[PDB]
Design a protein around this ligand. Structure first.
Ligand code: HEM
Ligand code: HEM
Lengths: 151, 151
């Protein structure tokens, strides 16, 4: 549990650096995993990262992703707050966007780098772990959500 | 004091809508007050709002503005937390950027609209006031900062 402070404190800085990381993340996700771009009308067909870094849609989504991940992160202390936040996301993505679930695990993977990258000798020993686990909370809560919904 | 909750709650929604308002604000400020654009190397010479809405620099600054205003807003309850946050900003802007102080009062003015605009029958009676006062805290703390620094 307490490994969370290590996460909550790392995430807080990350989420306020104003060097939009959510977009760096979304862009790295789509270059490395081009198939995930069909779900987005505006940039389905973009191949240049810079052209992606500019897409309004990609930017609104990064924001939405970072926005919900912070609520989660900021409330790792309330298991039900996590459950609901992630459950709603899962539901919406399964029923509305029909996004293949595995993409949540992969995107989280990308988030784990860009953090590991940016923390310093800082990005962690055993905490590289806290972020492994959190990458667990995000994928299991979302997968269960896909279940209830019946995927 | 308590008028703050009205502000803190309105600001919270505003700061998380993902329809980047900080940029809408910065862009409205510069169209209506073109002289304030000399302080920025990247867009000193831009005349089209859309071309402004895209400027990386304008975007990093909006973020920085919104970032500090939230800390302030989020701590109206701690007068010294406000003092320090606004004091640092004032100092930096006076000594580093040499920005005419009055621009802080004017930009706040712009922020007051875009909020009044966006809240509904919501944007307030007496609270239109809470935001008038807060627009006071921001300008007096910054002006004093310019003083200490000796402008
Ligand atoms: C870290 C996990 C993620 C979070 C927290 C997240 C959060 C959000 C939120 C709050 C919205 C607005 C949803 C709506 O009303 O439809 C959204 C939209 C969307 N998400 Fe995600 N999302 C995540 C991962 C993904 C992944 C992996 C994909 C796969 C490519 C994806 C594809 C979409 C699409 C297509 C939309 C609708 C786009 C639009 O309306 O412009 N999301 N997401
Ligand atoms: C709501 C009030 C404002 C806040 C909270 C705010 C906050 C910030 C922060 C955190 C930075 C980074 C500062 C640095 O290291 O230099 C910054 C930079 C800057 N601000 Fe502001 N600012 C505000 C108003 C203004 C106004 C009214 C102007 C006048 C045009 C202005 C012009 C600048 C400039 C030129 C920079 C440096 C730009 C760069 O490095 O790209 N700011 N501000």
């Amino acid at each position: 549990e307490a490994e969370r402070k290590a996460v909550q404190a790392m995430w807080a800085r990350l989420y306020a650096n104003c060097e939009d990381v959510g977009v760096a993340i979304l862009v790295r996700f789509f270059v490395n995993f081009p198939s995930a771009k069909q779900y987005f009308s505006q940039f389905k067909h973009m191949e240049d990262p810079l052209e992606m870094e500019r897409s309004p849609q990609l930017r609104k989504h990064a924001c939405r992703v970072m926005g919900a991940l912070n609520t989660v992160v900021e409330n790792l202390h309330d298991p039900d707050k996590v459950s609901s936040v992630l459950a709603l996301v899962g539901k919406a993505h399964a029923l509305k966007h029909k996004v293949e679930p595995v993409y949540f695990k992969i995107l989280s993977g990308v988030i784990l780098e860009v953090v590991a990258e940016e923390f310093a000798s800082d990005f962690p020993p055993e905490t590289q772990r806290a972020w492994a686990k959190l990458r667990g909370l995000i994928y299991s809560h979302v997968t269960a959500a896909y279940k209830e919904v019946g995927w």
